[PDB]
Design a protein around this ligand. Structure first.
Ligand code: NA
Lengths: 11, 11, 11, 11, 11, 11, 11, 11, 11, 11, 11, 11
């Protein structure tokens, strides 16, 4: 199955 | 570690 | 039909 | 500044 | 201010 | 087929 | 108006 | 390898 | 490790 | 005007 | 640092 | 019609 992985960085 | 994902479903 | 679900996993 | 990262994966 | 909008569509 | 439509706006 | 389109193509 | 194709469209 | 960073800027 | 900024980094 | 900048106009 | 303007910048 297909997933979108998401992340953030605080730069 | 935490991971945030979108599941995309074709149902 | 298509739907997007939010998943949060601990790995 | 907030940066967004994403990757499409197959699980 | 920047805002993001998104919708998933079936074509 | 599944597609995502994004709109990025300034408010 | 203008939108950014994602197609996640199953390959 | 599943991939995101993205484009800019006029709706 | 490679990180592909996305940001939106208001100009 | 909104613009998209795209950066590749190696950490 | 080198980044890619892109933006959309409607003519 | 829509046009996408690309640039490579030094920051
Ligand atoms: Na595949």
């Amino acid at each position: 199955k297909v997933k979108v992985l998401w992340d953030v960085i605080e730069v």
